[PDB]
Design a protein around this ligand. Structure first.
Ligand SMILES: O=C(O)CNC(=O)CCCP(=O)(O)Oc1ccc([N+](=O)[O-])cc1
Ligand SMILES: [Zn+2]
Ligand SMILES: [Zn+2]
Ligand SMILES: [Zn+2]
Ligand SMILES: [Zn+2]
Ligand SMILES: [Zn+2]
Ligand SMILES: [Zn+2]
Ligand SMILES: [Zn+2]
Lengths: 219, 222
């Protein structure tokens, strides 16, 4: 089958700037009728893929002409003249010249914005959960940029690595930031044996770790 | 208005089979090819096969011969894809699409896609989730604004649906992707409101886990 290679893996562009994506094939995509069946699709976050270009450079109906395509043989390029927030997502090139049809690995386009420091919230276990003999401490680190961040849990001054569950959202369309959730789960008994629970983060926006903690007690 | 509606998420036992449906409307079903595409872990797309409902003519990617079987019901304008003897590699999201290439014209009409059907191949048991409210202590963000949360944990399989105030509250809501750990999923969502809204007015987390017919609402109280 034809192998399709896309470069780069990720593209980070500021709104208003141009973007370019490359797609290379293991066989020329020139069909025997002289047409080249190379398509470009966009899959927006949480949406089904949609075709942007067909026959190398022909735009599908309703697609903005800020987007253009070119190439021939084994080398193709998609260019976005001026990036807008709606361009965020993964772009794939897919060839239909050789059976079976094959796709490239995709290129994620991320909107490059001004650095944003996380807004951190920490939550102790609910009474409901404690009742069941479990205890989860949750930390939300909302709206930060860049995406690169390191979160560690510390209980009474010592780092806890077991029982941690992390999740991240994709880049937000509304403000181009990312959000993260980190949950530390322990037994009710152990939870009730410690005092200080700290959610600690490392991010570009700070020379020192960003901290959020609470001390559990009674009254 | 051309539309393709796909069936709901499936949890299948290893070695069994399933039939996925793709109901179409808004166009002449028998006049266009319908293609099926597979997506694994995210960025990994593969072309499976295509069928021309008018004649029943199908073409398969060699890899899927014996794995996929396409059929189409002209009287109901529904295309089907049966997957046989399910295994690990079959867990994926499958899309049907009225791709739009018109061979005679050597050109294309607009492509329309179904929303996708997630298939999970596992022998793990269906488990209802426990919903926990998260009221601020330090995660109150001083004054001005306050963030609340909802912790959904210990369920199987995906998906679970979560809203705030029945969907009336969607601004400043962040719902995190479920993460699997020891055969169970955990998901969480946070909502930020102004100090003037909560606790004065109620904020409730609504959770639905279709697979276990669980519908639960949790009021976040101080
Ligand atoms: O079939 C061949 O051997 C000869 N080639 C042709 O007839 C041309 C087919 C061109 P096409 O753009 O429709 O191919 C496709 C079809 C569906 C795709 N998708 O992603 O769903 C991706 C590509
Ligand atoms: Zn060929
Ligand atoms: Zn050939
Ligand atoms: Zn200690
Ligand atoms: Zn000690
Ligand atoms: Zn301790
Ligand atoms: Zn101690
Ligand atoms: Zn055209």
């Amino acid at each position: 089958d034809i192998v399709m290679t896309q470069s780069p893996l990720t593209l980070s562009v500021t709104i208003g700037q141009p973007a370019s994506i490359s797609c290379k094939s293991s066989q020329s995509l020139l069909y025997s009728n002289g047409k080249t069946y190379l398509n470009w699709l966009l899959q927006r976050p949480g949406q089904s893929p949609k075709r942007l270009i067909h026959l190398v450079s022909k735009l599908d109906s309703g697609v903005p002409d800020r987007i253009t395509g070119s190439g021939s043989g084994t080398d193709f390029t998609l260019k976005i003249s001026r990036v807008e927030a709606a361009d965020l997502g993964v772009y794939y090139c897919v060839q239909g010249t050789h059976f079976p049809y094959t796709f490239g690995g995709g290129t994620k386009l991320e909107i490059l914005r001004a650095d944003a420091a996380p807004t951190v919230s920490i939550f102790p276990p609910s009474s409901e959960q404690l009742t069941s003999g479990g205890a989860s401490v949750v930390c939300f680190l909302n709206n930060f940029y860049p995406k690169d961040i390191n979160v560690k849990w510390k209980i009474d001054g010592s780092e806890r690595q077991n029982g941690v569950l992390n999740s991240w959202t994709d880049q937000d369309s509304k403000d181009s930031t990312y959000s993260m959730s980190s949950t530390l789960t322990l037994t009710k008994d152990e939870y009730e044996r410690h005092n200080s629970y700290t959610c600690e983060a490392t991010h570009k926006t700070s020379t020192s770790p960003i901290v959020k903690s609470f001390n559990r007690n009674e009254c | 208005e051309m539309q393709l509606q796909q069936s709901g998420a499936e949890l299948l036992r290893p070695g069994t089979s399933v039939k996925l449906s793709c109901k179409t409307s808004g166009y002449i079903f028998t006049s266009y090819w319908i293609h099926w595409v597979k997506q694994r872990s995210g960025q990994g797309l593969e072309w499976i096969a295509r069928i021309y409902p008018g004649t029943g003519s199908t073409y398969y990617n060699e890899k899927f011969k014996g794995k996929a079987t396409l059929t189409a019901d002209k009287s109901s304008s529904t295309a089907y894809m049966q997957l046989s003897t399910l295994k690990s590699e079959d867990s994926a999201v499958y899309f049907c699409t009225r791709w739009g290439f018109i061979p005679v014209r050597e050109d294309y009409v607009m492509d329309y896609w179904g929303q996708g059907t997630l298939v999970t191949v596992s022998s793990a048991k269906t488990t209802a989730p426990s919903v926990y409210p998260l009221a601020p202590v330090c995660g109150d963000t001083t004054g001005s604004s306050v963030t609340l949360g909802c912790l959904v944990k210990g369920y199987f399989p995906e998906p679970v649906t979560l809203t705030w105030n029945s969907g009336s509250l969607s601004s400043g809501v962040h719902t995190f992707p479920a993460v699997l750990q020891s055969d169970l999923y955990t998901l969480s969502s946070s909502v930020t409101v102004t100090s003037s809204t909560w606790p004065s007015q109620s904020i409730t987390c609504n959770v639905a886990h279709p697979a276990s017919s669980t519908k639960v609402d949790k009021k976040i109280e101080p």
